[PDB]
Every structure is written in C-alpha cells, then in structure tokens.
Amino acid sequence: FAATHNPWASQAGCLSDVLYNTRHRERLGYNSKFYSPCAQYFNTEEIIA
C-alpha cells in the first residue's frame, strides 16, 4: 500500500523501463536471441494488451 518500492525502476521512462522494456530496447539495438529475464515483467504494452 506504499506508492512504489523502487522509484528508479517503475515509471514509464525511468532507467529500467528504457533498459529492459523491449519497446524501448528496440530503439537501442539488442541481440534478439538473448534472454534477459526482466523482459517478462517490463513488457507493459504486452501486459496491458
């Protein structure tokens, strides 16, 4: 019932939501064969879709 227990990894356009989110990892250049296990948590567009 707090606001956010990690304010550097939550907002739409923070460090991790441009680092691990694939919709903003696409504009940085990534090997698509790799598995980074934050991808299943930070795909917010996929989650809300």
Partner: protein, 465 residues
C-alpha cells in the same frame, strides 16, 4: 439606426474604465463594394495618439524600438508581438442594410427625425452602420490623434483606412421615461462627410444630439507641432514597405557589384549560342528602373512576409530548424522506430515587362526542383507550366518562404541574394500588415481544422428574413 442606440448606451456604460467617445459612422459604395459588403464579417478600430503609436501597448514608450535584424527563427520579435497587436485592436458594433435607400428618407421612415440646415440628396446603394471610439485620455482631446479602421472579410483579407481628428470635427467641434424614446424623438443633429488621410475614401459621420458626450464638457485643441508629430508617425507607417523595397533595390545593386555580374544559372530554361545578350542586359536595367517606378505594397515580398509574422510560422521555423539540424540516421531508429519524411515550394512573384510597360504584382507560383538537374523550375498554381522565361521582353522577380531571393532575366539566369530588413524597426512592420486570425462568429465551427459550410451572407438579393 439600431446599433447606434446600443453602442451609444454601451459607451455610456464603459466610460469609467475606458474613456472613448461614441463616434457613429455610416459608409457607402464609395468605400467598399457590394460583394465586399454583403459578406463583411466584423469591423475593427484602434486609434493612434499624437506621441504614442497605439493604446494597447505601454503608455510611455515600448520595447518595439528594436529591429528584427534579419533573424531566422523569431521572425519579428517572436510571437509576443502577435498577441500584443491583437490586444490593441478592438471589435466594434456592426450592421449592413444591403438594399437601396435614401438616408434622410430612411431615418424619417424609421423612428428618428432629421433636422438639417438643408435637405440635400445622398443617393447610396447600401448602408453599413458602425460606431467607433475616439479616445479622450483626459477631458482634453487632441487634434492629431488619428483613428484607424479595418474591414475584415471571411477569407482573412482586409483593407485599411485611417483618418485624423481635424476632419472628423472640422465643424461639430467649432459649433459648440426611457432613454431610447427620447433618443428616437430628438434624434440626429446633422450629417457631414469625412475623408481619410490620403483623400481616398469618402464616408459620412452621424452626430446625434442626444449623445451623452455632449454632457461631458470635453475640451479640445489642435496644435501645429502635434500635427507634425502625427505627420511623421504617418510618414513612418507609409514608409515601411517602401524602405523594404529600397533595401531590395540596393541589395540587388550590391550583389551585382560584388561578383561583378558573372552570375550563374538558377532556373530551368534553355539557351541558344547565337542570341546576343547586350539587348537583354539593357532590358534588365530598364525593367529594374520600371519596377522601381511601379513599386507598391501589394507585391511579392510583402505577401511573402505576411504569413511569416504569425505564430504558426514561428512553430514551423523551430521544427524545420530542428529537422534540418539532425544527425546521420542510425539503424536502430530505421529498423523499429517511426521513420522520417517539403514537397514543393510556395513562392511569390513579380513579373515586369519592358516592351509594354506593364508590371503584374500579385502573383502566386509553385516552384519545383527539377529531378535531372539542380535547377529550379516554376509551375502555375493550377499545374500548367509558366512560359514567361521564354519571352525576351520580360523579367521576373521571385521570393521564397525562406525569404531568399531570385531576380530572373530571360534565359533562367537568376541574380541570387537575400532580403534585408535590418534597417527597419518592429512596430510599423507589425501594425501595417500583421496577419489576422479569425474569431468565432456565425457560420463557423468550434474546433479548428474543420470543413466550412457556406457563409451567412446577409443578402441584398434574397429575402433576408
């Protein structure tokens, strides 16, 4: 008759916070056309003081004594000048009776009573009724305070008339139940014509004897040095476009002096080896002198500068500079992001012809860059090609929305330069031809960017109902 009563009472109302007098006016066919008055949207006015050049700006001085200095992004002092010059223009009451009428007989058939010294005949075809306000700052009124007056049409086009205070009050200042029924009963004192400054427009002023302005005990004086300062203010407000034209002329002469005249080809028209060019050079000199003779505010560079002054040109200049200042594209944005994209230009032109001594001033031309070469090729606004670059008896000037420059002699050879407005201040360049944006009235939608229906068109042929 109707809007005179309302605006007279409303100027009785608002005298505490804005100190103007009710100056009722009528106009005729001697000023604006029947097609131009049938669809007339709304009238405007703002009076110029003797020492101050406006009312809406600061009372003592302004910031408008700085030149634009040929800037790129901020066109004329940014966009604060746009809202500033919009703030000083006031909207006035308005009505058009679009049918033939005799003014004395119309006011006699209506409720009022005319009491003239003599019943002359004013035969006019359509009467537009409006009231403007000459402002008394103190009780004293100045005989050099001039009153400007706009006529705004639905497309966005306007004409400009203005007139002093000597010709408004040349006689009527030297001759010194409800309110509506006594106003109807006593009524109008007399009628006289008033001229503009340049003696072009003859319109008529109506002096009502039941005006409350007669009960304010206004004082008046018309000095010579105040009239001379008004003469210099009007000198500047007329000399703005003409000093822009002289800046263009010595710009062309200096850029001919600079490289000597061995000028390249910038337009797509062929040439032949055999034809002499001494004749077309003498034609260039004669036609440039002819363009110096027939110079006018209705020209290419002024209409190229008219959409430059608004805020949309500032936003488009900022975004176009941000787009043209953009680095080499990276594959990361090419492969997943939104891709990027100025199809054909929108120029203006003056076409001057030496053999017939007829220049043609207001021309629109869509230019294009030819794909095979690096040359410019002009085209009409419909889509046909422009064949005046064939005629050896003509010349043509060009101007970009970037405000670049091309003076083109026959053969597609163009004297390239840039326009110079360093020598011009800000306030005349604003209040001469600031492009005005329409306000909401009858017939137009609420949100911008919509398809428009037909005009209201208060009509003289149909039954108006």
């Amino acid at each position: 008759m109707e809007t005179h009563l309302y605006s007279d009472l409303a100027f009785e109302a608002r005298f505490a916070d804005d100190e103007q007098l009710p100056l009722h006016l009528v106009l005729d066919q001697e000023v604006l056309s029947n097609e131009e008055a049938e669809t007339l949207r709304y009238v405007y006015y703002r009076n110029v003081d003797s020492a101050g050049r406006s009312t809406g700006r600061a009372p003592g001085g302004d910031e408008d004594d700085a030149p634009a200095s040929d800037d790129a992004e901020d066109a004329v002092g940014g966009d604060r000048a746009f809202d500033r010059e919009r703030r000083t223009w006031q909207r006035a009451c308005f009505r058009v009776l679009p049918r033939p009428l005799e003014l004395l007989d119309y006011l006699r058939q209506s409720g009022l009573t005319v009491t003239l010294e003599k019943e002359q005949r004013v035969r006019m075809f359509y009467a537009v009724f409006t009231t403007l306000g000459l402002r008394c700052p103190d009780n004293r009124l100045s005989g050099a305070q001039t009153l400007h007056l706009r006529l705004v049409w639905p497309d966005g086009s306007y004409r400009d008339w203005e007139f002093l205070a000597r010709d408004l009050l040349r006689e009527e200042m030297e001759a010194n139940v409800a309110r509506t029924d006594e106003w109807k009963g006593a009524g109008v004192s007399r009628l006289r014509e008033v001229w503009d400054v340049q003696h072009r427009v003859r319109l008529r002023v109506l002096w009502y004897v039941n005006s409350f302005w007669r009960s304010r005990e206004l004082s008046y004086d018309d000095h010579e040095v105040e009239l001379y300062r008004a003469l210099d203010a009007y000198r500047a407000r007329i000399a703005v476009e003409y000093v822009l034209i002289r800046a263009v002329r010595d710009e062309i002469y200096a850029v001919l002096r600079r490289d000597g005249g061995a000028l390249p080809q910038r337009f797509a028209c062929h040439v032949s080896r055999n034809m002499s060019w001494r004749v077309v050079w003498e034609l260039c000199r004669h036609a440039l002198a002819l363009w110096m003779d027939w110079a006018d505010v209705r020209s290419c560079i002024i209409k190229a500068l008219t959409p430059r002054l608004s805020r949309g040109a500032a936003a488009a200049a900022q975004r176009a500079r941000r787009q043209r200042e953009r680095s080499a594209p990276k594959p990361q944005e090419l492969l997943f992001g939104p891709r990027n994209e100025p199809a054909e230009q929108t120029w203006y032109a003056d076409v001057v012809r030496c053999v017939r001594a007829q220049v043609d001033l207001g021309v629109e031309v869509r230019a294009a860059r030819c794909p095979r070469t690096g040359l410019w090729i002009v085209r009409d606004r419909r889509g046909r090609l422009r064949r005046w670059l064939s005629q050896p008896e003509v010349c043509v000037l060009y101007v970009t929305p970037d405000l670049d420059f091309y003076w083109v002699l026959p053969g597609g050879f163009a004297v390239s330069s840039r326009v110079t407005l360093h020598g011009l201040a800000q306030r005349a360049l604003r209040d001469r031809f600031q492009n005005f944006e329409a306000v909401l009235a009858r017939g137009m939608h609420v949100e911008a960017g919509r398809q428009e229906p037909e005009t209201p068109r208060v009509s003289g042929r149909r039954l108006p109902f």
